[PDB]
Every structure is written in structure tokens, then in C-alpha cells.
Ligand binder design. Sequence first.
Ligand SMILES: NC(=[NH2+])NCCC[C@H](N)C(=O)O
Length: 238
Amino acid sequence: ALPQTVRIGTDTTAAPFSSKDAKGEFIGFDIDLGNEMCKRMQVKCTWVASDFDALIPSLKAKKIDAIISSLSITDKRQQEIAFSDKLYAADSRLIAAKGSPIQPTLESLKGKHVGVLQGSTQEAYANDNWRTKGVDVVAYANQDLIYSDLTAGRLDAALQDEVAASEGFLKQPAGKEYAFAGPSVKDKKYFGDGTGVGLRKDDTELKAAFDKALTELRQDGTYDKMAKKYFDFNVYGD
Ligand SMILES: NC(=[NH2+])NCCC[C@H](N)C(=O)O
């Protein structure tokens, strides 16, 4: 009763999890996971690019069937949609210029310009904790714009997923003179517990198939094989 084609929405400004190569094709760990799960599910899968903040609306409107886009499993989102089991762990952390004294605190940030991705958990955290209290929190339609405004000095800092920032910006030439500003920001309520496949709540059979495939590809070591392409550490977490 699975669809012949599972349509999977993703935002492509999140290397090494999801982005586009020079041909415009989807690449990254999210794509590898999604493709491998679909293979084991014996379904065709079609990737659909969209802005991050359009993913959950598109899912609810049935324009896509699933979201694989470093989508954090939060209490708040679970009131709207369902999730597969955890795909990998994710933390949030600030980045700023190398040498910056910036810390993820109100005192340190009050007066600064801080970029966040529209529709993200980081946007939610920053709006409640920082924007109300004077911090210029600027929301962006995609993370590419954020990095651009940061390196152009239009932003002083940016709050986003730690691993994506590290592997996709900081460890790349463009992020050479940038670094994490302070430790990971810990807030269980806002940031949730790793990422998962976002699904409509009533698609019970689809969720069971993703979950089965995920457990199996983890059990036979395929997960770790695919992960080693991008990461030299345990990206799954606990
Ligand atoms: N493909 C992306 N740009 N993903 C951003 C994910 C940010 C965060 N994990 C969230 O779920 O809100």
C-alpha cells in the first residue's frame, strides 16, 4: 500500500547532508540514506527540492510524501507530523569570525546581527530567546544566503546545525577564517532529539517501511559505510 513512487522533499543548502552537485543532482548523506531506504523498501523515490520552510507545509498538503532534510524530531513538530526513527544526531551551535568573543548568550549577542534559517529550530530558539530581547535576529529563506551575509560581514554570527556548519562551511575554503563561537547550544525542547524522516501522521505503513529499512541498513553496517564518506566520527550518536 506504499506509493509506487515516494516523493521526498529536501532543502539543498545543507552539505554534506543535502545539496546539489554541478549537474544539479542531489548529493549528500541524507540523499544516500533516503535512496538506500527506498531501495530496501522496494519503492521508487523522487527527490523534490524546496526551501526548508516549505517542507512541512508541502508534506501536509501531500505535495511530497516524506521529508529528509536534517529535520529535527521535536515535541512541537510531532503535534503536526510523524517521524521515522532517528537518522542521526544533531546539535546547534553558533559560528562567527575567527577570534570572535561571541557566545550563545543574550549578553554577548545583544547588539549583534544573527542569521537563522526560516522555519528551523534555530529560528524558533533565537526568536524567543534573543530577538524579543534586542538581538537583531534575521531569518533567511536558505542557508546559502546566511553564509554569504556572514562572510560579507553583514552578519556577525549564525545559528545552525553544528555538523553541517563544520563539514560544509568551516572545513571548506569559504569558512577558513570562521569558527564556532562558544559550545553547542543545549535546549532539548527547541532542538529535539536528532533528525528523522518527516511523514504525515496517518501514513503508518510508510513509517513502518522506513523504520524497517533504517534498522536493517544500520544492522548490516551499510549506514556506517555510507557515513564514512562524509564523517570520521559517530554521526548517529546515542
Ligand atoms: N536542509 C536543511 N537546511 N536543514 C536544516 C535543519 C535545521 C534543524 N535541524 C531543523 O530541523 O530545523
